[PDB]
């Protein structure tokens, strides 16, 4: 018994793929069934989906509406149609063989599997944010700092997200104070890093700040800086 | 008037499921083609994540995560804007907020008026009724001669319906014994399995050199087929 997975490859996210399992030594007429299962890089092992000779089939809740068992038995092939992939399907797929014995249903003769690479991207421009959170006191002034991977300009903007609240615009274009901002708060930048001064802290400043480019699509935001106020 | 956004649509949806966001504007009515208007969303304890904005001369922008599978469409006569969603996921489960960025300049395109949000929750609630398989431990170290015990607990009975695979780095998984204690053909003798309670146990009487590896159980009680996470065996 032999099983030959065919089909991998880069495949954009929101993309369509279909993978081949080709089977040899048996019929998948005949207890017969094939089972396809991925690994993700450096993970474990999820179970897909399974079709059996009956055409009975069964899917996983994380792939069912968008993948697509089936086989052509006239080529002792099954497939699994991937549609609207996203970065969690990059995995290696293998097939297998799942033949009843009721007590004996095992999967085997796994295939050497097929890689899936789910990607467009290393031009996306990266924000990091530090500290990631702080505690101060009443009075104080804080800085936060936030720094892009390239040159973005001057199109910075910074967010201040209360708990349980949207975001509210704080500061735009690096040092421009929206509306109702008052002026105990400031940005600034220095080539690709942009600080936010909080002065005078206030209890209402408990929050989290979020930085965001939009010189290039994607906007990209920093992974945000709570705020504690003790 | 307030100036607002006001978000509605979501709620609880199986993955493969499909949705659609509303953002309706108060107290300012969308430019032309709903420009401006952006999608965010921030899944539950994380970030901000951008997802997609109706940007000038017909150019839908959209992240790389949702492209294919989101659509944003306004329509201005009812001054609202939509976010339609397929092919969900898991991962998509976020609250999802709309925005109005500012349009007059490049030197200005900042989101204002975010709406309050609107919880989208991507699962099929079935986490409770698929079968949980658990190892202990996820991983060890042993000498060669060293008898190695690997155990997996099943959440829920699943009679003796239980296989142990074996992989390889860089290889295909190998099925080592099926119904507990079942040894496939060509597998050596000092592999073998049992089971106590709901405990299954996979014993390597005495580790060789090629046994180094990671083994996985898989019960078949139930569709959905499920496996441990793994136990791997170093030198």
């Known amino acids: 018994v032999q099983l030959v997975e065919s089909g991998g490859g880069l495949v954009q996210p929101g993309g369509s793929l279909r993978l081949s399992c080709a089977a040899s030594g048996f019929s998948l007429s005949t207890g017969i069934g094939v089972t396809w299962v991925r690994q993700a890089p450096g993970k474990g092992l999820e179970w897909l989906a399974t079709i059996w000779w009956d055409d009975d089939n069964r899917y996983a809740d994380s792939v069912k509406g968008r993948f697509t068992i089936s086989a052509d038995t006239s080529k002792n092939t099954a497939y699994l149609q991937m549609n609207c992939l996203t970065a969690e399907d990059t995995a290696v797929y293998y097939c297998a063989q799942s033949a009843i014995t009721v007590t004996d249903s095992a999967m085997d003769h796994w295939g050497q599997g097929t890689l899936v690479t789910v990607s467009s991207g290393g031009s996306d421009i990266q924000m990091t944010q530090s500290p990631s959170s702080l505690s101060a006191s009443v009075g104080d002034r804080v800085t936060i700092t936030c720094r892009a991977s390239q040159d973005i300009s001057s199109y910075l903007n910074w967010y201040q997200q209360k708990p349980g609240k949207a975001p509210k615009l704080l500061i735009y274009?690096?040092?421009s104070l929206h509306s109702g901002v008052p002026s105990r708060f400031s940005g600034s930048r220095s080539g690709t890093d942009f600080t936010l001064t909080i002065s005078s802290l206030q209890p209402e400043d408990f929050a989290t700040y979020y930085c965001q480019q939009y010189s290039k699509f994607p906007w990209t935001f920093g992974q945000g800086t709570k705020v504690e106020i003790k | 008037m307030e100036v607002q956004l006001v978000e509605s649509g979501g709620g609880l949806v199986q993955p493969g499921g499909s949705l659609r966001l509303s953002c309706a504007a108060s107290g300012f009515s969308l430019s032309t083609s709903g420009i401006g208007v952006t999608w965010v969303r921030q899944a539950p304890g994380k970030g901000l994540e951008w997802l997609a904005t109706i940007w000038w001369d017909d150019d839908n922008r959209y992240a790389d995560s949702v492209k294919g599978r989101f659509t944003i469409s306004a329509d201005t006569s009812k001054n609202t804007a939509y976010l339609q969603m397929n092919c969900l996921t898991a991962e998509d489960t976020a609250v999802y907020y709309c925005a109005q960025s500012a349009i007059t300049s490049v030197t200005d395109s900042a989101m204002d008026h975010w709406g309050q949000g609107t919880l989208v929750t991507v699962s099929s609630g079935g986490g409770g009724s698929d079968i949980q398989m658990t190892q202990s431990p996820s991983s060890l170290s042993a000498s060669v001669g060293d008898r190695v015990t690997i155990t997996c607990r099943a959440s829920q009975d699943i009679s003796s319906y239980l296989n142990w695979y074996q992989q390889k780095p860089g290889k295909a998984p190998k099925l080592?014994?099926?119904?507990?204690?079942?040894?496939?053909s060509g597998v050596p003798s000092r592999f073998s399995g049992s089971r106590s309670g709901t405990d299954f146990t996979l014993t390597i009487s005495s580790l060789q050199p090629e046994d180094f590896a990671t083994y996985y159980c898989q019960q078949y009680s139930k569709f959905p087929w499920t496996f441990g996470q793994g136990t791997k065996v170093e030198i």
């Open positions: 274009y690096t040092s």
